[PDB]
Design a protein around this ligand. Sequence first.
Ligand code: SF4
Ligand SMILES: [Zn+2]
Ligand SMILES: [Zn+2]
Ligand SMILES: [Zn+2]
Ligand SMILES: [Zn+2]
Lengths: 355, 417, 752
Amino acid sequence: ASLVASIVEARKKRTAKKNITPYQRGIIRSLILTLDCSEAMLEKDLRPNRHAMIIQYAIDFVHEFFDQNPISQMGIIIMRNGLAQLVSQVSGNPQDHIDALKSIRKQEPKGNPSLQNALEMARGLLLPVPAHCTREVLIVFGSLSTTDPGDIHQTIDSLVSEKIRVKVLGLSAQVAICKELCKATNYGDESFYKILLDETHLKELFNEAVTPLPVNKINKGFTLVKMGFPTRIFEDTPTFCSCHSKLVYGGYFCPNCHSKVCSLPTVCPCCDLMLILSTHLARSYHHLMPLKTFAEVPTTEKFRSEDCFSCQSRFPILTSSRYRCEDCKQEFCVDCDVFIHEILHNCPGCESKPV
Amino acid sequence: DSLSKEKLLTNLKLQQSLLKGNKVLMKVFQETVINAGLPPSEFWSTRIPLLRAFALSTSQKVGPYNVLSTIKPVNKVNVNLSREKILNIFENYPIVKKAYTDNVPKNFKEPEFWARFFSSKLFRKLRGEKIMQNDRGDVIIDRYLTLDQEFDRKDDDMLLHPVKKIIDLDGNIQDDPVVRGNRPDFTMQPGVDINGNSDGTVDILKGMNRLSEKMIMALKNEYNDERNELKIDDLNESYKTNYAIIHLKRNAHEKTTLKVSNQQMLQQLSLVMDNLINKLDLNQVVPNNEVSNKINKRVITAIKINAKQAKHNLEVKSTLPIDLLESCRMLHTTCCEFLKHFYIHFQSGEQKQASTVKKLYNHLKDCIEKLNELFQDVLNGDGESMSNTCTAYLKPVLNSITLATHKYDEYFNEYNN
Amino acid sequence: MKFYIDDLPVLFPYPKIYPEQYNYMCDIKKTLDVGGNSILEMPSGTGKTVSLLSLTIAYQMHYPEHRKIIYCSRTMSEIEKALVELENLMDYRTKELGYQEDFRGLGLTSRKNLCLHPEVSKERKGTVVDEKCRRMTNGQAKRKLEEDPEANVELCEYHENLYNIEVEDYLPKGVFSFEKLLKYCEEKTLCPYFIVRRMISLCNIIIYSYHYLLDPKIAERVSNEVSKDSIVIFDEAHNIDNVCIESLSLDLTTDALRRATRGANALDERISEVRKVDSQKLQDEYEKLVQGLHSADILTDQEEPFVETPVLPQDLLTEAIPGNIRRAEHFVSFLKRLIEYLKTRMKVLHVISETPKSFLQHLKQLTFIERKPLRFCSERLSLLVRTLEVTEVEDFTALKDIATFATLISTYEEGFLLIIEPYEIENAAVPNPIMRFTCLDASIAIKPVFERFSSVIITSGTISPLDMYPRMLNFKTVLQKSYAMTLAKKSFLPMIITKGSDQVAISSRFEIRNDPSIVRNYGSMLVEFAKITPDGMVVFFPSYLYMESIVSMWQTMGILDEVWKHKLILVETPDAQETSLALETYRKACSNGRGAILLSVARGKVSEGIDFDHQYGRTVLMIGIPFQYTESRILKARLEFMRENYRIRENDFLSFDAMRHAAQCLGRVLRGKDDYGVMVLADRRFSRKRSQLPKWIAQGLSDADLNLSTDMAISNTKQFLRTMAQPTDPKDQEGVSVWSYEDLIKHQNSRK
Ligand code: SF4
Ligand SMILES: [Zn+2]
Ligand SMILES: [Zn+2]
Ligand SMILES: [Zn+2]
Ligand SMILES: [Zn+2]
């Protein structure tokens, strides 16, 4: 009954994932990572520490977000001891955020939260943000209480007026205020306020939260952006960079002012334009067209092939692990189907199928 | 509020404080504003988000909390006196603020002062402790007891207001107030002695309650509907993701600035199958060591240039003296600041900024002459051997400077002439 | 959703419905078609009232009898919530029909809740509000002002506008909420008290309290204009025996006799003044008593009797006033020597429990005071106050108690006992003595409801079991059963904690209540729920003095001071104004998410109608068995009383009544099929009370949960909050707990 339980849990997951839709999602993103050094995250119920696995899983999320969404920029606000602090603003450089993260790892967490203070200066950080740059904040919380200098509801209505969507990730259980926050922040939706059960589910929440979020018709931002690629020149001399003024052997040229920069994807510092490559736009076409799930055929029918169409391995008999792409009508194994849906972004059976 | 770009430019004392905090921003400020003569208004106009970040850092305060419940005295008790805790107590309790404001400068000093404040009856009374009449306290602070009681009645008066109807239990108790039944037991009356005087647990409950409404009014500061809250969405339609889908149309245009036949490919396929089924020879593939020699010549021609590049595949070590090195660094940095302001000027697209473009172009011409006389000075003081390094190093920024001059001249002849 | 039951078009404002509500409506329809009585125990996590309202409105509009429907409720808050529910229903049905149908149905409350005159309303006591409203709106004020415009006994503008306009033109047709009608009557300067006193015959349905049903002073006044053949429905009247007893049980103080002497002396001095101005009014009163005219005969309908009816209207006398008290001076001297008898019977030394017959026999033995003048004294005093025009009745208001007691004891002798004790306050510096009256049968006041209405329909939430209620009330139902919910998965979590995490047995008995080791255990539990409470948590105890004692020593030793950092705390204040403001602060605290902790009595004001849901209803503690205090003579007499009559066991009843109070308190968590919580119970003796528990409550209770401790209780609450910290598939409850209309049709076809 182990395979039957695995099949019915995969059915429940498939019922959750039936809504495969090509929604327009948040691409030009601006992120704030609210963190807390409070005394609640000192508890050794988590091994070695709540704050420990916060530090390492935050480093992993920083890497995953800079990979999956390179063109976006993400900031870090730390809550500690009655007043929140800023250690990293929004940047295309992960290195500064990683260095701040390991500085927080070196230091001790202690304090008590002021979520209104964190939201207020997060509001000020997102104040000079363009309209196409979507404003999103991620929230972690290890407690059940927060004292705040003033009322939270004016802050709530003001941030709703600032057109923001926010996910909140609590430690213990659901809190009614954070549920209301995700409700009013996310147009009545309360799927944005989720609580973990263990570290495996916690990491799964991180891997979900790297992904972009679909955007509504009513908050329409249909416009154009003035984009331009830089040109890499493998130069023969140590040469000054525009930003840090240090002598670099090779690098890029600006498409307009011909200045060089250390890294991509970054704006120009001089003529002030976003300079990316085809990789960064190429990173999210599998968001732009998704990959619909593949028809796991039953063992009752006769099959076109009794071995895998892709990895070329023979199919088993009690259950039929022959998973058929509806866009290609070729059955694949469970291993190849899971790997293609998690990594690959084209069906080779659909490459075989002529159109 | 004071959140506009005008107000951020107006806060000159905040600009002074942040400038005094930073160091390279000071050095940039003297070189631009003091040495070159840059007006402050457009010095800080390129730094408005940084000004805003500093303004938010300075302009924030913390949540109120009960100082008394948290702080314990721990035999003279040791105290970790924090001025932040002192002001926490002050704007927590204006009675304590008023007791402070007439005692330090007039009656007694600060340490004897806070010694009396820890000694006082009102200390342990307003603290989470019922006041004991055995305690001597501080007789000077005992004059503040009826003043704080007046404050209690005044705060109760301003706090008292008509109550929301559905929540109000006074409507329940006044629904039939003419009931003459029997009173409840000793259980339901409050804790009193044999003389009828209470223990005061209702009084301390009133005090902690009044602390909670002070928190409510601190939230409720300067800084119909029943139908919706009685409506139930449990048996209603869930929220629909009204997100727009995207569809693609794809037609890539080809680039802007001989054909074999089916018979030809069939006969070559026939020939190559004939050769394949005919024979494969192992040692025929070895080149003749002269065509292989030209292969080696081409390979080593690639290797020489590519490994010469790979010889040059904190910054690099420099033969410049540190004074000249820093002087060319800061002149490069301020000329970059000029050119970014020039892109602000040119990309503005306004006739209003014409005199600004003119005067700044004069400043850039002065920067050009500064660079030329700089290169002349390094030439005559060093025999050009590293002044070549200085000129080649500062070459791309002056190249973009010349690009800006040529753009200004060409556009000037386009619109004027 | 408009569907069909067997003969009636039935509408529902929601696209979905629950089978328990559906079958409950079906059994209600069966009871309506058969006539008579029924007792049904509903599952308190089911939305009931909107289904009730839909069925009653449909029944009234379609059934050609069109019988009036009498809702019978407890609290004005419950009345207002029912008004909101019905207004939602009629808005839905108006939108469905495309038009509003003609209907009126409203609530009922006091002048203190209804005096829109801003000056008369400002008095704190509703007795004073009613007295001043009498003094300037009673029609005597109007006659004085009409006779002399200089006679400055004014009239309420809100009162006079109701005679400027017509009674049917008081409101447009429809249903008005209380705030809505208050806004209307403020706009048009109208008195809603006299409006709703004139709407009793005019509304199609009615909802009000139980006091205006039971107490005869306010019972027959409502009961005149209502139809004989109306539909009667109750709500949560499991504690109606207490209300019936307290409507007919009275005590006496030394203050009462002192105030009686002072009022009698000032009344006789005013009688001397009245006889020296004009004896014509008193002679007219005396000859009208010769003829035998009563208070209703002499007084008009607007003016009301001064001594309102202590006995049932079925127990009133119709003959003439006797000649012993027919003269005003003779009646006053008779009352003075009655006060002399009450004073000389007041000064007893020990506890006496005598019959009304024994009191009347000793009365006739010592003095010459008789039963028929003691019945007629209330009418005689009311007529004397009306004739004498003694409007400053501040000294005179105490004699209402004496006339009330005299007419009560001279009408009632069986099912009642007169208790005489030397300790008004047992724990006092001096023994004030007391005479006590006891109502022993609660069926007496609901008897005229039974013989007045056939369709008397009875329901409550946690009434378990059913059989002792036709014992305590001399009635029977044609059918009765109970209902438990067919919920998808369990979301209320009941367990019985008989021991702390230290495995120490726990109880709240009135002797061992001050046991500091068990107290330290209790606060270890308090600490562990204070650390984990997300939104809200409530603890009850059997007795408020014991609450104040334990919380006093708790604050003394500082565990309250250290748990201050987690949430807030509120306790049931003696003033319900401060309690209302406390509830407002708790509502705002759960709104902003700080949250607070609540303390109130199982027999307290919070325990009788206050609702808590989805952050307010999250978990509720009961510590020990909520017993009534044991050494109450009224309690022991009632215990003996119901055993000799209906063979009701004493300790079994006491346990059952404590479980009734506990279940009523613990039913304030769950509203629909969406709320959740953990139900935590703290006593050793709770384990043998599954039979006394309601069916659905004990259904979620496990036999392994009958004996649990604090550690695995803490564990099970943690796995609970992880369980419903996650979403659920709708298809798991799409047709088994929640139904569509098509699911209802499919179940109908499955049954047939
Ligand atoms: S008529 Fe109504 S508003 Fe006027 S005094 Fe009487 S109760 Fe108050
Ligand atoms: Zn650089
Ligand atoms: Zn550029
Ligand atoms: Zn495969
Ligand atoms: Zn495919």
